[PDB]
Design a protein around this ligand. Structure first.
Ligand SMILES: Nc1ncnc2c1ncn2[C@@H]1O[C@H](CSCC[C@H](N)C(=O)O)[C@@H](O)[C@H]1O
Ligand SMILES: Nc1ncnc2c1ncn2[C@@H]1O[C@H](CSCC[C@H](N)C(=O)O)[C@@H](O)[C@H]1O
Lengths: 326, 326
């Protein structure tokens, strides 16, 4: 059967060493709590996290996987001789039947912008249904950050048309307006990796999601987020905002943090970019504030929508609402 | 209006210096034939080729463009003060009405694998309808090449699963079979850029398309191509074949060749790859032969289909038919 996408998606995740080592170490550092205990792996994929749990000493791991990759998970487990310790089960976690409640849930559920097409609702469903009172959740929480940015690659693309004269003796500088409207004037969230120098101010946490928190499902439906305020470092053309997340694994010891910040090593999640309609020049101490909400799209409840109200310096407040890139 | 794709596509073409300089110089080297003459630019895009023709001395250029980018073409021409020499006209070349027959047609019509979603039929329609007897076609011809290849990036992806043990202490080598079926076992043409070291034998020309040739439209409908034979250079895991094209501009003087070969500087066309179902080991002097045809797909006449019958060394003849990547 056709499976190009199957392999590519899992290759990308497992090739993401930042992600995979964070889970590797985040699970292993909890060995004392996992040794001789049971684990549910929500969305086991190739089974890698389930085998990490077994390495950490778990007696039984339930590796639940909804798509066809479950077949590969079964094979990886059998091949590593762990079929008596890791039970790969097909189908959605919402309807899986387990022989027992579990001591722990592990899951990599995070989407682009944390919440775009994420498995969070499934993890919470599984927590409610299958996790023992006082059970371990790995990771245990997630936090969302926002900061104003100047995107060097975007700047290059905006400038491209004025470079045509130098290359080919045809003046196309008149197309800057066009490029700006097309590249910035849309209402789509753009997934792109930034570096530290693109960041124009101190990043601000705008949401914290404690996965054990009661009523988190209802919060996610209504929208998560809040206000933010920061001050710019120097002269720059601000292009908009970047948002990203981190998730935290409890330690034995200090917690382990898997971060997708532009200051930290790159991951496959990159960051989620929210472009203004056009650049705005900022200076040292330019105040930038706003209010942001992440919520389900109307027409597709799995698709991320962002509501943003913002103010840059002395410019009037502006609204720009986004929906995730196709 | 939403125009992200508009700008990106044209940015990519104009940013492709190999392509754009080839047209720049290919047109300019024909200055003696263009000076004081008329040109039809089929699919003018941003108008760049039309302005090249004006620089070459054309009295009048008809810049015909079917999509919304015509608006930008109009602006570029007005901005360069050439509205009296370059006439940007909206809509498909098939229904454009010109005041006169033209002395020359210029067009960049080539698709991936030369013929995937190409404008060749439109160029030939325009040639028949609008070009004067003995008129100049730029470029004048196209040639197609095939060679057996070993794709280093594919090899890396095939090997990936056996590297997991080293990174994360989980053995996933058992997934090689899976990766191979998924990455090679499909029937899609893959667009990817190769280097000279991926090429396993002397490339063979398998088709030549003379754009003035009578009945070329009927050839394209029936399928273009032919047999080929070559001999491998050394020990390698052969993954399949790469195909590519060149187009030729007559000189004043020697012709100018725009090539998309893996031995030549990279272009946005890259090459079109035809993977075997699994790798085959070849050695010095391993004979590789076959027959290849490029033709319209059944369900979408603009989509490229490739019929391939091939024989590697002592292995029996095999058929594998492909259709272009979604
Ligand atoms: N409701 C659900 N129940 C079970 N599996 C699900 C699910 N929703 C998504 N999935 C699966 O969850 C996986 C998430 S990707 C993470 C895979 C693996 N745990 C790893 O870390 O490498 C995908 O394979 C997807 O098919
Ligand atoms: N039948 C047709 N008539 C007119 N324009 C067409 C056409 N089919 C495709 N096009 C246009 O032809 C262009 C080809 S891309 C090449 C654009 C430009 N000449 C350059 O070299 O940079 C696209 O803009 C496409 O919209």
């Amino acid at each position: 059967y056709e499976c190009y996408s199957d392999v590519s998606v899992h290759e990308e995740m497992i090739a993401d060493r930042v992600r995979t080592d964070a889970y590797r170490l985040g699970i292993l550092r909890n060995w004392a709590a996992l040794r001789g205990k049971t684990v549910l792996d929500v969305g086991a994929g190739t089974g890698i996290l389930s085998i990490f749990c077994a390495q950490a000493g778990a007696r039984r791991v339930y590796a639940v996987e909804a798509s066809a990759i479950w077949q590969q998970a079964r094979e990886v487990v059998r091949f590593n001789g762990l079929e008596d310790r890791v039970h790969v089960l097909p189908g959605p976690v919402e309807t899986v039947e387990l022989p027992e409640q579990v001591d722990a849930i592990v899951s990599e559920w995070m989407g682009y912008g944390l919440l775009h097409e994420s498995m969070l609702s499934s993890v919470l469903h599984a927590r409610t249904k299958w996790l023992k009172e006082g059970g371990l959740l790995l990771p245990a929480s997630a936090e969302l950050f926002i900061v104003p940015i100047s995107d060097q690659m975007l700047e290059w693309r905006l400038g491209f048309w004025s470079q045509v004269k130098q290359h080919y003796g045809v003046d196309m500088s008149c197309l800057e307006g066009f490029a700006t409207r097309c590249l910035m004037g849309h209402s789509e969230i753009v997934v792109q990796g930034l570096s530290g120098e693109d960041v124009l101010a101190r990043p601000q946490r705008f949401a914290q999601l404690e996965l054990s928190r009661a009523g988190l499902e209802q919060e996610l439906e209504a929208g998560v987020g809040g206000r933010f305020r920061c001050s710019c470092y120097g002269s720059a053309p601000m292009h908009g905002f970047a948002i990203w997340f981190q998730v935290t694994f409890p330690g034995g010891e200090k917690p382990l943090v898997l971060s997708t910040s532009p200051f930290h090593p790159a991951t496959h999640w990159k960051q989620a970019l929210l472009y203004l309609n056009e650049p705005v020049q900022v200076e040292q101490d330019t105040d930038v504030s706003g209010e942001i909400t992440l919520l389900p799209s109307r027409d597709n409840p799995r698709r991320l929508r962002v509501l943003l109200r913002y103010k840059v310096g002395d410019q009037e407040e502006k609204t720009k609402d986004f929906a995730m890139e196709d």
